[PDB]
Design a protein around this nucleic acid. Structure first.
Lengths: 54, 80, 75, 339
RNA sequence: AGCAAACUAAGUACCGUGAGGGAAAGCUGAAAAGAACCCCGGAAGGGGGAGUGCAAAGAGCCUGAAACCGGGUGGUUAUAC
RNA sequence: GGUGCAGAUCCCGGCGGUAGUAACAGCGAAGGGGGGUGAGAAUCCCCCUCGCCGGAAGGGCAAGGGUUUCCCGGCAACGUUC
RNA sequence: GCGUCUGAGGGGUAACCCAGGCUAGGGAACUCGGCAAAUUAGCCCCGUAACUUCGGGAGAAGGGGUGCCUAUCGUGGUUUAA
RNA sequence: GGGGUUGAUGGGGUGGGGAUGUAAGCUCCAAGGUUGUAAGACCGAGGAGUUUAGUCCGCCACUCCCAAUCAGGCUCCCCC
């Protein structure tokens, strides 16, 4: 249910795991991509104009 | 009513447990049974007391017990 | 000198019952320590399980209304 | 829409608190009513009750001259042992304090029963002479004349007690000079209820009702259970509102002690003053009381208070009818109160 | 406060499945000279006594305010703001 | 010249009162006696008995946690008490 | 397997609250409302309306039996087994 | 509110009066059956006697048999 049980089923695998590049457990196996280390569709490193607040 | 003196004391061995039996009569003279099964008990201040058992005689078969003694033990021997 | 009796006493479990069902058996044996000191100056009360056992052939809440006791109250 | 309703609970007796002396005392006395010196009440004990069979004595009774059935209460009447005489007069400031007392048990009364509760006088200064004539000097300027008496419960094994109560009774009669002499005689001796009472009289009752402990409002003031749904919802045994506003959170039913109160009783007519214990004792020992073994008072109706309470009696304050003596009986129930 | 960051690691612990967000925390005196030793407790840089040292506020260690609470000093109370 | 504070349901740190109060009940469990250890035992251990569960509180198996397993020694916190 | 769904002991145990059990007599007067609560209830046999989409309705309705023991009997299966 | 050894306050014991409804065992009978040559003895749900029983009674009286002690605290000597 929308309350706590919504958190219940949450024992399965992380939808983002250790991507081999940036040391962040953020590799979306399901999308065949890392949203952190950029490995998967950019040869270049994922970097943005807004890594922070300017 | 006070107990005068003891006359009967046997020894019986039940369920892997020691068991003593005592019989005596009060000053009113009624015969009442005494159940006691423990040899050790912490003295207050401050030792251990050993229950004496030298004069007790050993009973090994049920009907060897006096008939009246036996016919009351049934209500109790279940829950030793 | 206290009378080192081989005495037999009769107890009445009247007061213990009539109140909380859930507590009787403990109060029962606890009541046992009451008179034994009172009528024999007991400093510490050592009860054989059997003479204690018979009060509860029942578990929680059924208790015989009376019982006989024998005491070899050593020093 | 705000239908009529009598105010529930009884506002008449506020405050409701527990008495401070187990044996109460009257605060007024019915008039003497044109007669000779005698007492106007008596002390006793609540032993038990039963039901009795009688011919009706009420001349205007709808049941006149017939056998009808009526519950009746028994009151064991142990002898009374007087103590002293107390002097009341219009003192300074125009009040009615105690002028003086007049004690005498050194002349008679080698009884330590009183000693159990009071460390009373010694023989060293038993010089009541200057006290007694003080009354004589203060004669004609006296208004009221009570009496110091004690109960003798040691003559009743039913009540396992040995230190007694000493209490008071005011005496009315003929002339004042007569009354003091009448009382003077009564000192140092024993007095039966027959010395004050006779059968067929009316009698008044002030005493302490059956205690009950802390109570609930449902029981204390007979407040009403909320209808149906509250037998399922939010609570049931309480009053809803507690006043229109803090403008006097008022005399409203609120919890508290009930019982053990100083209360009142009117219009009680005695039945029998017997002396054979076998005539009244029920089967197997009267319940919770024992076996009556002195003279007893046979009073019908109900009498307030728990069993084994001292009770102090009194002549009628506003008697409904003047009774004749001896409403003769036809049956006494000796059956067990048990069963 | 000074950039978050002066400290045993700071984008560190951590909150988030996620892009991300994002901390707290300095001072023993110059020299540990860190209280040897004796009594209590089992112990606790705990008690007591002694000792080091200008000084011990001697490990929780510069100085040490209030809100606080406790002992005491001085007044002072159960017909009353 | 970052400049004088009582507030801005300010921020941050400390501590108040309600106060040893609520709660440590509610979903069908429950312990008792004797002995041992140790400073200290309702709560830990030994014995006996007893009650409860018993298509689950039993038995075996994942993803996850990552040593939660075992042995030895301990108790300031950590354990809703100890 | 458990007395670890981890705090306990005292008590004639007040009121009251939550879980319950039971209440004479009347039996919906409570009440927006029979809400709640109650009554029936397993099984076998007998027996079963109006209406209808003829299939049901339909455990319609209603009535009757049901224990314990001493005997029996029938039917069927099974064992190398018409 | 009582009691506290100068005592019937509570237990015990004995009676008293009550509630359930007649303990076990024993004997007899038992619908039938098991045997057993018979004689007899064996099972049997149950009925009767053995028995207003047996168990129980937060009620009463008598009975000092046991228990009210040991102990601690607070305080007055103003009046002669």
């Amino acid at each position: 249910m929308k309350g706590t049980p919504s958190f219940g089923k949450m024992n399965k695998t992380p939808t983002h795991v250790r991507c081999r590049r940036c040391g962040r457990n953020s590799f979306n196996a399901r999308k065949g991509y890392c949203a952190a280390c950029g490995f998967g569709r950019s040869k270049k490193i994922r970097r943005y104009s807004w890594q922070n607040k300017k | 009513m006070k107990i005068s003196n003891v006359e009967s004391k046997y020894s019986m061995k039940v369920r892997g447990q020691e068991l003593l039996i005592e019989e005596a009569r009060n000053e009113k003279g009624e015969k009442i049974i005494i159940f006691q099964s423990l040899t050790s008990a912490k003295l207050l201040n401050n030792e251990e007391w050993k229950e004496n058992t030298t004069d007790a005689k050993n009973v090994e078969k049920r009907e060897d017990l006096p008939q009246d003694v036996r016919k009351i033990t049934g209500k109790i021997l279940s829950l030793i | 000198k206290p009378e080192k009796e081989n005495f037999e006493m009769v107890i009445n479990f009247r007061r213990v019952i009539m109140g909380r069902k859930t507590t009787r058996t403990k109060r029962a044996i606890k009541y046992v320590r009451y008179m034994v000191k009172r009528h024999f100056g007991a400093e510490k009360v050592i009860i054989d399980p059997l003479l204690a056992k018979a009060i509860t052939m029942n578990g929680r809440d059924k208790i015989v209304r009376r019982v006989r006791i024998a005491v070899k109250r050593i020093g | 829409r705000k239908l009529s309703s009598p105010r529930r609970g009884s506002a008449g007796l506020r405050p409701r608190k527990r008495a401070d002396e187990i044996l109460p005392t009257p605060k007024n006395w019915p008039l003497v009513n044109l007669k000779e010196p005698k007492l106007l009440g008596f002390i006793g004990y609540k032993a038990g009750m039963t039901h009795v069979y009688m011919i009706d004595d009420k001349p205007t009774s709808p049941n006149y001259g017939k056998e009808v059935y009526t519950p009746v209460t028994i009151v064991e009447s142990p002898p009374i042992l007087g103590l002293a005489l107390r002097a009341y007069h219009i003192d300074s400031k125009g009040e009615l304090s105690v002028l003086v007392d007049y004690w005498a048990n050194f002349e008679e009364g080698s009884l330590k029963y009183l000693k159990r509760k009071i460390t009373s006088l010694k023989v060293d200064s038993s010089k009541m002479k200057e006290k007694l004539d003080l009354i004589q000097k203060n004669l004609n300027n006296i208004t009221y004349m009570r009496l110091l008496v004690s109960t003798q419960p040691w003559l009743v094994p039913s009540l396992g007690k040995k230190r007694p109560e000493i209490v008071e009774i005011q005496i009315g009669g003929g002339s004042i000079q007569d009354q003091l002499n009448y009382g003077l005689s009564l000192l140092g001796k024993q007095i039966p209820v027959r010395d004050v009472f006779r059968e067929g009289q009316l009698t008044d009752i002030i005493g302490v009702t059956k205690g009950k402990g802390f109570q609930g409002v449902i029981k204390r003031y007979s407040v009403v259970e909320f209808p149906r749904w509250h037998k399922h919802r939010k609570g049931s045994r309480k009053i809803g509102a507690r006043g229109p506003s803090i403008s006097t959170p008022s005399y409203v039913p609120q919890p508290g002690q009930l019982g053990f109160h100083r209360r009142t009783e009117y219009n009680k007519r005695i039945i029998k003053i017997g002396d054979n214990v076998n005539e009244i004792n029920p089967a197997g020992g009267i319940v919770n009381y024992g076996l009556v073994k002195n003279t007893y008072l046979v009073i019908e109706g109900s009498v307030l208070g728990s069993r084994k309470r001292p009770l102090f009696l009194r002549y009628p304050i506003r008697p409904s009818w003047s009774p004749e003596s001896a409403p003769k009986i036809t049956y006494v129930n000796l059956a067990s109160q048990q069963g």
